[PDB]
Design a protein around this ligand. Sequence first.
Ligand SMILES: OC[C@H]1O[C@@H](O[C@H]2[C@H](O)[C@@H](O)[C@H](O)O[C@@H]2CO)[C@H](O)[C@@H](O)[C@H]1O
Length: 138
Amino acid sequence: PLIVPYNLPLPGGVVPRMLITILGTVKPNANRIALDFQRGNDVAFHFNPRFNENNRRVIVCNTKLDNNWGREERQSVFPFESGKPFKIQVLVEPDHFKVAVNDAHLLQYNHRVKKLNEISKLGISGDIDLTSASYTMI
Ligand SMILES: OC[C@H]1O[C@@H](O[C@H]2[C@H](O)[C@@H](O)[C@H](O)O[C@@H]2CO)[C@H](O)[C@@H](O)[C@H]1O
């Protein structure tokens, strides 16, 4: 297992056809999970499953620029379950990040940060046991 929060370097940032794969298991009675694709202090793509926001489960996505969160993009399709193993795949496409969970398409997030090759770290945090975090060029 990996220690959470975990930092995965993305050498030379991201680029279309780069696939990032996160394997782990959600803890019992989880509250949150977060992926933070960072460009220095900015967060190009924040992917944040919330297990209890007003007794609803929702995935919140956003970008943080100069310490300011922008407009949230919310997804009520929620494939995670407390206690269960998951796979998150984030595929960088030309106009968006494409996210699949457990081999099922979940959402896309249009690029707000344009300098893809400066998005050089992925932070993985929250109520999970982390098994692996890696990338491959497809
Ligand atoms: O936008 C992602 C960002 O949200 C923060 O929580 C928001 C919350 O979603 C919103 O409903 C409320 O109005 O303000 C909060 C703070 O901006 C999180 O704290 C942060 O971790 C990110 O997930």
